[PDB]
Amino acid sequence: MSGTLLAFDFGTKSIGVAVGQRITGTARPLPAIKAQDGTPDWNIIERLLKEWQPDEIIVGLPLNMDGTEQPLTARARKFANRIHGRFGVEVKLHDERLSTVEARSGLFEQGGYRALNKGKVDSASAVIILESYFEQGY
């Protein structure tokens, strides 16, 4: 089975992304969120997107402004609508569903789902956006 899919964490003039390959089940990291004068690496991703057939794409930059939910992402979701009409690819915007309910009747076991990480900024949120699509099975 094979289905190369992509996942980016970014927006205007910013490139922090993860590339996912559904051939072995791994996600490669895409360079740091710095596009050229507003030009995202379109030659870099497109080369790995079409050469391997883009099975699925997840795009959007989730950033906390005050630490909690952030209504500013509304501009992020629309960004996903841009890369879509640009190449005509099936892109999906990642929504912050982890922060929706107020009560605490879900995450009860404070110990679990551990993950070695202190604070990396190497487009890890994208491979996280990427790891999010694996949960949607799309």
Distance CA(2)–CA(127), nearest Å, equals 18
What technique determined this structure?
Answer: NMR
Contact 53, 70 (CB under 8 A): no
Based on its alpha-carbon atoms, the radius of gyration of the chain, rounded to whole angstroms, reads 15
The answer to whether the CB of 12 falls within 8 A of the CB of 23 is no
Beta strands in the chain (DSSP E): 4-11, 14-21, 26-30, 54-59, 91-93
**Domains of the chain: residue spans and CATH:** 1-138 (3.30.420.140)
Q: Is the dihedral of CA 97, 99, 102, 104 positive or negative?
A: positive
**CB-based burial of residue 35 (10 Å sphere; 0-12 exposed, 13-18 middle, 19+ buried)?**
middle
Residue 20 backbone dihedrals phi, psi, to 5 degrees: -110, 135
Q: Are residues 48 and 7 in contact, defined by beta-carbon separation less than 8 angstroms?
A: no
